[PDB]
Amino acid sequence: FPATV
Amino acid sequence: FPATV
Amino acid sequence: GAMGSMERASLIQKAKLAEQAERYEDMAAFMKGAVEKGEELSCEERNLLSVAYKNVVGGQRAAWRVLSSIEQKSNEEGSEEKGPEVREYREKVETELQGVCDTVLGLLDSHLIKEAGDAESRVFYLKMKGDYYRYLAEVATGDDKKRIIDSARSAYQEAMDISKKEMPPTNPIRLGLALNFSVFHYEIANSPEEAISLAKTTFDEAMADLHTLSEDSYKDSTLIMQLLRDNLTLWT
Amino acid sequence: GAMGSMERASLIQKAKLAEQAERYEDMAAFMKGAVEKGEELSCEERNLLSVAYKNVVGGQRAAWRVLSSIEQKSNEEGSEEKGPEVREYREKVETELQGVCDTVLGLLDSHLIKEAGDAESRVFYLKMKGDYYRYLAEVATGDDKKRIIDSARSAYQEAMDISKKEMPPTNPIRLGLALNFSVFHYEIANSPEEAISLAKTTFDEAMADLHTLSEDSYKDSTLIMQLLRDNLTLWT
Ligand SMILES: CN(CCN(C)c1cccc2sc(C(=N)N)cc12)C(=O)C(C)(C)Oc1ccc(Cl)cc1
Ligand SMILES: CN(CCN(C)c1cccc2sc(C(=N)N)cc12)C(=O)C(C)(C)Oc1ccc(Cl)cc1
Fold first, then answer.
1. Among the listed residues D159, D166, D165, D164, the one whose alpha carbon sits nearest the alpha carbon of residue D202
2. How buried is residue D65: exposed, middle or buried, by Cβ count under 10 Å (0-12/13-18/19+)?
3. Which of C201, C208, C223, D198 has its CA 20 to 30 A from that of C28?
4. Which residue on chain A is closest to C180 by alpha carbon?
5. In terms of CATH, what superfamily is C8-235?
6. Per-residue DSSP letters for C23-75?
């Protein structure tokens, strides 16, 4: 999965 | 801590 | 309000303890209680709220993906029918996840967003609103999946508009918002070109502003810039 | 019985799904429901039960240790009084832990142990009884700390007596029981010499029986023998 913050 | 199972 | 009889300051203190103990469900409940005291949240308190619910829903999303994968397999050609159990349990986890998302969206709507006037608080909360509609979108399939997606987009867009007007390009909230809105475009809205364009413009405009920052702010900004680059590397 | 309306087989199936999703509280609740159907548990089902509650109480113990450490520090000379919050929250976690332990002990007493006739099931359940009284002992401080310790010892002892009579020295349940009873001696009963003696005798007698085993049983036994050696290395 792609990075989120 | 020591190992337990 | 199960936390209605506890002092606000005690709730914040216990949220921090719960975090140290990695008790994120407790941390979230303490912060929910703190929000429901009705006072605006400080910057540290906003980040306690977001850390707690991020960890809770993050575990739920991870479990839902595991179960959805099992469910998809059992629905393939040649699979042995095991009954309704996989679907039932995925539904159970999904309902719990939706409950957490609705709770967070409830706190933002009553009344964190309407009382947030400063860009730093208003953008933070609108980013959260976009994030939790995004998590609802990830599991949505009904007559309202499109409406959930548009609710996420609307919140993200209002946050971007404010952030571009009111914060520098290196502001970590602005950067994190763009990171997540970019992921929304890629994973939810089926707009990978918009996702890549947003991540690249965000990265480049931050790069050009780094010269204005102290060593500590530089570290904060470059950390999120690296996540933007990571996603671009995944996507190209 | 919140799970009273679900089929036993469905509860076991969902316990396995919960395990794959790392949802150990759900896994424990499903297995509690399965036990309360009143039928004896198979070997696989016994291990689903123990895995679930081990993971739940393991997280609680980890949190309690974090909080107890904070509490001890705040009680040192020169510490700033932060109020009752640290104690209150440690107490909250402690009470939840004691509730999980009482629940497990309840399942063993009603009626898993009394219906367990084979050594493999009876020793497994009595080891669990010793383990969960041990966890209660770790947090005990009242007029009954000594009685909790003796309840753990009694259960462990009955399990050892059966295991020595009825299982080979390499049996993994026998080995795991001795591993944990040794830790009980060291950490709970303040008998480190007994703890070291038990671990060493258990290891040596298993070593001498390995020649009788298949490759798969050899792997199972040597895994626990390594944990015995690890503890001996920590303790000498
Ligand atoms: C380093 N950093 C700052 C955030 N953090 C750590 C806190 C800042 C202020 C107060 C607290 S109290 C607290 C606590 N866990 N007890 C944590 C913090 C970040 O995570 C990066 C750099 C990734 O910036 C973003 C950007 C947007 C978003 Cl939404 C999240 C992170
Ligand atoms: C490899 N192993 C066997 C146990 N395991 C893995 C299972 C055996 C049979 C059925 C199931 S169903 C299941 C599941 N997680 N879904 C796991 C198992 C062990 O852990 C060692 C070797 C450490 O032996 C002990 C000894 C005593 C104790 Cl109390 C615990 C472990």
1. D164
2. middle
3. C223
4. A4
5. 14-3-3 domain (1.20.190.20)
6. -HHHHHHHHHHHHHT-SPP-HHHHHHHHHHHHHHHHHHHHHHHHHHHHHHHHT
